[PDB]
Amino acid sequence: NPARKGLYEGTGRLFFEFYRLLHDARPKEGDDRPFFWLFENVVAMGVSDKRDISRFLESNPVMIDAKEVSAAHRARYFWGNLPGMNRPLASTVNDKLE
DNA sequence: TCGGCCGCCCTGGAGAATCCCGGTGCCGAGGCCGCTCAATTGGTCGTAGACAGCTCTAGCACCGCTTAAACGCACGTACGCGC
């Protein structure tokens, strides 16, 4: 999109609200109750953008393409700390691949 | 990204003009009257036209050549028409 404003301008900066409230909702250190998070974005973002997000969320994104399980070209970055979230995509008979 | 601009259908609402409907008034048309002159009737002549007869002119019909032109097909570019 030629008119794009990046990550710190326009509607790009709306992620930081989520980042804040996620941090506020996260248990404090020493409180070992289970807690999990998942954030999504488009693969086609700026390299400096992706880097800044990777620095802020203290993780590298997993790239997952929808087409393997969802028959759509929607390649998306997924930040999060779900266990075993690196594992390859499996297909289920219920899901539609065509 | 993403919010602000031109057809399309659908629809009808103000709105200036027009049709319909009454109310009034007037002057032009329908009807009555005298009268007088043009339509009618009767008769008579005179010739325009109806009709018989003849004739003889041209109009229709036919036929055979003879090319002059009408027809038919290709074709291509100039003009009719839509935008």
From Swiss-Prot:
Changing residue 55 to Q: In TBRS; uncertain significance. Sumoylated; sumoylation disrupts the ability to interact with histone deacetylases (HDAC1 and HDAC2) and repress transcription. Inactivation by auto-methylation may be used to inactivate unused DNA methyltransferases in the cell. Highly expressed in fetal tissues, skeletal muscle, heart, peripheral blood mononuclear cells, kidney, and at lower levels in placenta, brain, liver, colon, spleen, small intestine and lung. It is found in: Nucleus; Chromosome; Cytoplasm. Required for genome-wide de novo methylation and is essential for the establishment of DNA methylation patterns during development. DNA methylation is coordinated with methylation of histones. It modifies DNA in a non-processive manner and also methylates non-CpG sites. May preferentially methylate DNA linker between 2 nucleosomal cores and is inhibited by histone H1. Plays a role in paternal and maternal imprinting. Required for methylation of most imprinted loci in germ cells. Acts as a transcriptional corepressor for ZBTB18. Heterotetramer composed of 1 DNMT3A homodimer and 2 DNMT3L subunits (DNMT3L-DNMT3A-DNMT3A-DNMT3L). Interacts with UBC9, PIAS1 and PIAS2. Binds the ZBTB18 transcriptional repressor. Interacts with SETDB1. Associates with HDAC1 through its ADD domain. Interacts with UHRF1. Interacts with DNMT1 and DNMT3B. Interacts with the PRC2/EED-EZH2 complex. Interacts with MPHOSPH8. Interacts with histone H3 that is not methylated at 'Lys-4' (H3K4). Interacts with SPOCD1. Belongs to the class I-like SAM-binding methyltransferase superfamily. C5-methyltransferase family. It is linked to Tatton-Brown-Rahman syndrome: An overgrowth syndrome characterized by a distinctive facial appearance, tall stature and intellectual disability. Facial gestalt is characterized by a round face, heavy horizontal eyebrows and narrow palpebral fissures. Less common features include atrial septal defects, seizures, umbilical hernia, and scoliosis. Leukemia, acute myelogenous: A subtype of acute leukemia, a cancer of the white blood cells. AML is a malignant disease of bone marrow characterized by maturational arrest of hematopoietic precursors at an early stage of development. Clonal expansion of myeloid blasts occurs in bone marrow, blood, and other tissue. Myelogenous leukemias develop from changes in cells that normally produce neutrophils, basophils, eosinophils and monocytes. The PWWP domain is essential for targeting to pericentric heterochromatin. It specifically recognizes and binds trimethylated 'Lys-36' of histone H3 (H3K36me3). This is DNA (cytosine-5)-methyltransferase 3A. It comes from Homo sapiens (Human).
